[PDB]
Nucleic acid binder design. Structure first.
Lengths: 77, 86, 81, 81, 186, 95, 73
RNA sequence: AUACUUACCUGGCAGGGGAGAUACCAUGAUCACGAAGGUGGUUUUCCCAGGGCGAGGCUUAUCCAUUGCACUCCGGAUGUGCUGACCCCUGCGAUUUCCCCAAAUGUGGGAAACUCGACUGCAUAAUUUGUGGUAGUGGGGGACUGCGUUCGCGCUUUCCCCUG
């Protein structure tokens, strides 16, 4: 039985660009290569890109962190 | 904590976070404030977008209801409990 | 903690605002650790509604926005504990 | 446990209604109940905020995301009440 | 309406247009910084500590530990016994501490004003070797039903040594609660 | 917590050196502070006490907000009790 | 810290409701006391009719509102 | 029926009003008389923290008697809903053992023992209620645009007013 913690650890080792959805925001999304995570579900990315469905513009942010409560859905590549 | 114990079985009106008013027989509660209402009716205030008309009330009968304390704002006694005497 | 100070304001008059813009003015009779307060002989004023005088009202602590205490309250003496 | 929780556990197996924070109201037969208000239902009828309805076969709902629940009035005859 | 479908006609704005604080030179009232039943206790706690500390300097200059008429004999030979029962007769203290060696002189201290027995005495053996034999054996002895401790008297041997009243000494029978066990001995 | 003992004083050092020290120095020096709450309104006043929950005891406060042309509205409250959850941002006198 | 009794929906095609009016659909493989679910063959199911399959994904229980089983368990 | 070794099945930690004053008790303090403080008592003022005593006092009917000459309130009793000074315990529902008072199998006091309560503190502001993405951010009456139109309206752009 695969759990989210073990799966998140796999994505981390793989360094794949994981996309994340925002809490209460459908129009905004974030994607980046995860570097680490804590029990609070907070995720840190090496190179983040803020993409909007309406604007389709990818804003470069770099090494950043994101709150776990704001996470809504994880997506691979 | 007699402030709440004294009010068991009374006809209390629960105020919801969304603005609704649940009037029912307050049966029991808990530390989380989860109440049990009997013969509850739901009221909601709708704004008049057509003209200067009286506020529109839409009653709705529910019966027995269990309200989560997190969604409960406040509660007051609308009237005494249903008298069983003739 | 600080909620203990809130439980000491029984029988005094204050004006509390709610997260939905509702204002409630009345005398306090009891408060709990969850910030839930019971006010007797209280008057409620919902947003875009008419004021109404309620003889009692038990409010939860989560939906509270802030309180308005009297001008003569002894803070230095009441905050010792 | 809490008395409201016990009234919910004994209500297992009967038709109950559940409203969520997103406004949806679910009415159907209750399958499983838990202390944390997690409820499992079957053959429910959902009502959206707009008014449209839909059909489902087997559904589970988180407890924290429930506004309130409607149970059979006959439960008032419980021994605790 | 729902929190997600609510049309925010006036969402949360910043605070850039709301900086209207008071000027710097308009400092706050200096006398409005104090608290009751928090500093007066510390103020009284500091004086009693300092008052004694100042009183300590006066006693050291007046009284000399080494130059004590009661104290006699070689310091390395003399022994110190405390926690002794008040009912212990002088002969009982001799016969119990003579097993380790002959006692040249024995001095039992008494209250200066009350005259009551202090509970500790100084034992002077004839030979320095006889004392050391008691250091290990005497410690932990049971005299008159009450355990007693025994250590070489440091009043005139150890550099920088002083008794309780001067902040030194050993044993914590009256130290912080639940910090010094009564069963353990020196 | 990391210190499950009941004698833990983690909260003590936190308010003295942690981010919540902004309120301690405010009550110490009796300096004003502007707070942005979930009401979309800004509250400027002094502080007298607080705790870990970010609940401050304010006095001589001035509420300010705007509706809609955009019209500003302000009032005064000499003594009030602010909750923490409804707070968004806090700003001491930058002087 | 009692976990939810989601053993019934294990290895079943479900359709989950999210907070911001978003919905997904996939086969469940595991859960946690906090309702953190890992579903495979998941579709985004955006507001429009378009469909986008990505496969294995993770969902936080704090955002899960309701979950219905299309296979009736 | 007792003790010993193993497997299996059940379970959350700290506690017992709080802040001041204690000259006096205990701790009989490890240095030639001594600590202070602290800890555990006893004494002593309070936020009164809950109770027990209900004297006194407040509201109104029922019953009884009075034809009364006062100007310092007030005839007697029951019922409804209240208040309440002074004086007592600092708070346990249950169980176990020692000593003692005793109307001696009961009625009580001085000691602890470790046992349940959902009493409190921390895990409790880190997803499931006790610290927010439920913000409250409007509505209406007159003049004032456009698109579609079933001419009722949906969306959209302006000024002055009543309303919260």
């Amino acid at each position: 039985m695969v759990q989210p913690i073990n799966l998140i650890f796999r994505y981390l080792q793989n360094r794949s660009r994981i996309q994340v959805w925002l809490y209460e925001q459908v129009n905004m999304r974030i994607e980046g290569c995860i570097i680490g995570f804590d029990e609070y579900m907070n995720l840190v990315l090496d190179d983040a890109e803020e993409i909007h469905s309406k604007t389709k513009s990818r804003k470069q942010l770099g090494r950043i962190m994101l709150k776990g409560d704001n996470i809504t859905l994880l997506q691979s590549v | 904590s007699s402030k709440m114990l004294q009010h068991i079985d009374y006809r209390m009106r629960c105020i919801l976070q969304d603005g609704r008013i649940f009037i029912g027989t307050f049966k029991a509660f808990d530390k989380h404030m989860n109440l049990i209402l009997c013969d509850c009716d739901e009221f909601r205030k709708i704004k008049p977008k057509n003209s200067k008309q009286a506020e529109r009330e839409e009653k709705r009968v529910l019966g027995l209801v269990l309200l989560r304390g997190e969604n409960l704002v406040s509660m007051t006694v609308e009237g005494p409990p249903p008298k069983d005497t003739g | 903690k600080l909620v203990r100070f809130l439980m000491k304001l029984s029988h005094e008059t204050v004006t509390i605002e709610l997260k939905n813009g509702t204002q409630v003015h009345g005398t306090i009779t009891g408060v709990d650790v969850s910030m839930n307060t019971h006010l007797k002989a209280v008057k409620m004023t919902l947003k875009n509604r008419e004021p109404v005088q309620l003889e009692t009202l038990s409010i939860r602590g989560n939906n509270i926005r802030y309180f308005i205490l009297p001008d003569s309250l002894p803070l230095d003496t009441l905050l010792v504990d | 446990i809490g008395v409201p929780i016990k009234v919910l556990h004994e209500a297992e197996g009967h038709i109950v209604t559940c409203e969520t924070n997103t406004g949806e109201v679910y009415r159907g037969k209750l399958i499983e109940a838990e202390d944390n208000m997690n409820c499992q239902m079957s053959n429910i009828t959902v009502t959206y905020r707009d008014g449209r309805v839909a059909q489902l076969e087997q559904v589970y709902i988180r407890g924290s995301k429930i506004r309130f629940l409607i149970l059979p009035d006959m439960l008032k005859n419980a021994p605790m009440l | 309406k729902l929190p997600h479908e609510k049309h925010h006609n006036q969402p949360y704005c910043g605070i850039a247009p709301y900086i209207r604080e008071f000027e710097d030179p308009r400092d706050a009232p200096p006398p409005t910084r104090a608290e009751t039943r928090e500093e007066r206790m510390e103020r009284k706690r500091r004086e009693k500590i300092e008052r004694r500390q100042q009183e300590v300097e006066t006693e050291l200059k007046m009284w000399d530990p080494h130059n004590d008429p009661n104290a006699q004999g070689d310091a390395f030979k003399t022994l110190f016994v405390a926690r002794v029962n008040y009912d212990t007769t002088e002969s009982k203290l001799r016969r119990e501490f003579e097993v380790y060696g002959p006692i040249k002189r024995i001095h039992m201290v008494y209250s200066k004003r009350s005259g009551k027995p202090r509970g500790y005495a100084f034992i002077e053996y004839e030979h320095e070797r006889d004392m050391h034999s008691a250091y290990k054996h005497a410690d932990g002895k049971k005299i008159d039903g009450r355990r007693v401790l025994v250590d070489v008297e440091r009043g005139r041997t150890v550099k920088g040594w002083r008794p309780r009243r001067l902040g030194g000494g050993l044993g914590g029978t009256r130290r912080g609660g639940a910090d010094v066990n009564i069963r353990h001995s020196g | 917590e990391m210190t499950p003992e009941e004698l833990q004083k983690r909260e003590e050092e936190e308010f003295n050196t942690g981010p919540l020290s902004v309120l301690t120095q405010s009550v110490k020096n009796n300096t004003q502070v502007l707070i942005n709450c979930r009401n979309n309104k800004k509250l400027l006043g002094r502080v007298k006490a607080f705790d870990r929950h970010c609940n401050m005891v304010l006095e001589n406060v001035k509420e300010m907000w705007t509706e809609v042309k955009p019209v500003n509205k302000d009032r005064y409250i000499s003594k009030m009790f602010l909750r923490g959850d409804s707070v968004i941002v806090v700003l001491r006198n930058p002087l | 810290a009692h976990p939810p009794e989601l053993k019934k929906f294990m290895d079943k095609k479900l359709s989950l409701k999210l907070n911001g009016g978003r919905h997904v659909q996939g086969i469940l493989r595991g859960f946690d006391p906090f309702m953190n679910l890992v579903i495979d063959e998941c579709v985004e199911m955006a507001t429009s009719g378009q469909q986008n399959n990505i496969g294995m994904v993770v969902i936080r229980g704090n955002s899960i509102i309701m979950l219905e089983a299309l296979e009736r368990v």
